[PDB]
Design a protein around this ligand. Structure first.
Ligand SMILES: C=CCNC(=O)[C@@H](NC(=O)[C@@](O)(CCCN(Cc1ccc(-c2ccncc2)cc1)NC(=O)[C@@H](NC(=O)OC)C(C)(C)C)Cc1ccc(CC=C)cc1)C(C)C
Ligand SMILES: [Cl-]
Ligand SMILES: [Cl-]
Ligand SMILES: [Cl-]
Lengths: 99, 99
């Protein structure tokens, strides 16, 4: 579709069979989600936002639907003010910026 | 143009006489720039991202130029770790997400 930016670009995603709201964020390298359960082992990452650094859990090869578009990729879980979908999955679902 | 999301979407802006690089961020409510001088009135503001909040100065009705597109809008100045263009100005130059 085509999403204008007069509001927050909030969409519905599906991960682990549950629906969630998340924010499509082109200023983000990475995709980071609020606390939740995911299968398998995880690795550490430090990621930096506008406000400083947080520690998150990295899970790889995780299926996720963004707006009904299927992707499988890396998901971080951590203390974030919102769910955000960063470039790493935006490119999987064929996103570009246009003006 | 059409801008890809394989890489960070960085662009040049002219503002306040200076050239600057900055990051087209669809997730950002506001536009925030590193420390710099702007004319006229301002008020203090706390803004929130990953890792918490920072204090900025808010100037309104500032002329900016982005990729040759003139807009006018609110610009926050402060100790952000990188320059970001937010939805408040992205709208004015007709920028949308597409997939
Ligand atoms: C007051 C209104 C609500 N807050 C906001 O709208 C703020 N927006 C952001 O922080 C956001 O759009 C992220 C900005 C882009 N940022 C840009 C950015 C990039 C690098 C940093 C570098 C950065 C930090 N430290 C050292 C080097 C800092 C910010 N990227 C990241 O922070 C990402 N980090 C990276 O991509 O790092 C590569 C990531 C999400 C994964 C932490 C994500 C975001 C979006 C909305 C909200 C509020 C919603 C409840 C919070 C966070 C500011 C920027 C306006
Ligand atoms: Cl990925
Ligand atoms: Cl504005
Ligand atoms: Cl429009």
């Amino acid at each position: 579709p085509q999403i204008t930016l007069w509001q927050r670009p909030l969409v519905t995603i599906k991960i682990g069979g549950q629906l969630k709201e998340a924010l499509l964020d082109t200023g983000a390298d990475d995709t980071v989600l609020e606390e939740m359960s995911l299968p398998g082992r995880w690795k550490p990452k430090m990621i930096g936002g506008i406000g400083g650094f947080i520690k998150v859990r990295q899970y790889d090869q995780i299926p996720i639907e963004i707006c009904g578009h299927k992707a499988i990729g890396t998901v971080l879980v951590g203390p974030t003010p919102t769910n955000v979908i960063g470039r790493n999955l935006l490119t999987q679902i064929g996103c570009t910026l246009n003006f």
